């Protein structure tokens with residue numbers, strides 16, 4: 001019924017080469033070559049980011065959709081790309097990152113980029129079972145893709161329900177992943193969250209066309225349905241006229257040392 005639902009159905013029907021071409025079409029992308037080379041040599045001292053995810057929070061921060069201040073909580077921190085980006089910012093007092101870490105490449109990776117000494121990581125943490133704690137800036141980047149839209153809907157609602165649980169009175173700043181924002185249930189829930197907490201929703205250009213993920217943020221006020229639909233239209237437009245080419249820019253580089 002929604003344009004996002006049409007997008008998801010069409011996406012799932014794409015042939016293999018069509019899918020690969022489509023997913024990068026007109027997206028923005030950071031060049032990860034430098035960071036990967038250094039990490040391969042165990043060079044944790046260097047001013048690099050541990051993940052591609054850092055590019056998303058940099059865009060959100062630099063473009064004024066999110067202020068990053070005080071006590072930062074990073075729910076689903078993974079390797080720590082957002083946590084280390086936050087730690088380098090002058091208004092940040094501390095960072096606590098929690099993540100499941102049920103694989104491997106997806107546990108926190110220690111680094112010595114700026115403010116590393118004010119970051120504390122806890123692996124094997126389920127943020128859904130944990131008690132909440134206060135924060136000034138609440139970040140959450142959880143939402144695991146599924147070809148099944150109903151699974152994506154369920155996962156999104158769970159994340160939003162838990163976000164509301166964690167969203168404290170002193171939480172002025174927030175950024176939550178909305179995996180599948182186009183589902184009517186998700187739109188309806190976000191609208192009620194917005195009445196309580198204000199804020200708005202945004203598409204980060206570093207997201208692949210193969211996901212409809214958007215971010216609910218504190219830094220801008222906008223119309224949820226309008227913003228989601230505009231993204232659905234962009235995604236469908238790219239599907240009918242795919243360039244097959246991403247726009248590559250410089251990675252998230254950071255200063256180094258203690259704070």
Ligand SMILES: Nc1ncnc2c1ncn2[C@@H]1O[C@H](C[C@@H](N)CC[C@H](N)C(=O)O)[C@@H](O)[C@H]1O
Nearest residue numbers: 051053054076078080081082099100126127141
């Ligand atoms: N219930 C949960 N509790 C804690 N972490 C989770 C949960 N579900 C998923 N995760 C983790 O959340 C992470 C999401 C990642 N996309 C985060 C990337 C991160 N923002 C970065 O820049 O590196 C994954 O590593 C998941 O393992």
